[PDB]
Prior knowledge:
Elements: E1 2-7, E2 13-18, E3 23-31, E4 36-40, E5 48-58, E6 64-68, E7 87-94, E8 97-103, E9 112-116, E10 124-126, H1 130-133, H2 148-152, H3 155-158, H4 168-176, E11 191-194, E12 199-203
Parallel strand pairs: 1-12
Antiparallel strand pairs: 1-4, 2-3, 2-5, 5-6, 5-7, 7-8, 8-11, 9-10, 9-12
Family: Belongs to the thaumatin family.
Subcellular location: Cytoplasmic vesicle
Keywords: Cytoplasmic vesicle, Disulfide bond, Signal, Taste-modifying protein
Amino acid sequence: ATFEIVNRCSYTVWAAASKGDAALDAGGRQLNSGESWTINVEPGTNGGKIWARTDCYFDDSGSGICKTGDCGGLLRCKRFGRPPTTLAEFSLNQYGKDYIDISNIKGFNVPMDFSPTTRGCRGVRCAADIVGQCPAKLKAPGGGCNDACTVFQTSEYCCTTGKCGPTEYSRFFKRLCPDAFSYVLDKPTTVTCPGSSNYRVTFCPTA
């Protein structure tokens, strides 16, 4: 499956794609304002994620650091990135179908649209100004808006015991972005697409 990753933001981002234990495709690449990078993700990929990283420096071997989304200091990500990271999440060819969603469970750094380029389902979007409206105690000094598990490390925010409910913090994400996961047990906003669909992830989809 192809995922076209498009940076409409006015600033550079370093796209990242991983299923947690491995890169997807090259795993990472710089996208200047306007650039598009198309990756190929193996069918049957379960638990894939694509995200943006901001204010990165890499040296000539592709080692450095990002202020959001850093995946162990590599340009080419093999693991998930350091919150805060808006997440495009997908599992492909799961008993005949694809599942996609955007999640704020690991915070928000960059607005995002996650849409199929092929027929038979709809896309999802979290494009509100969550960084600018971010509650005081969630603001990440490094840039972006942390989820409350990251900040406070409690069973309630992290949903460790599998029994959490919504919170004042999760409700901020859900109000700004109703169509993205705001906490682990949020009512699902997952979209079912045909097996083997193709996709576009657009950073900053709106002015």
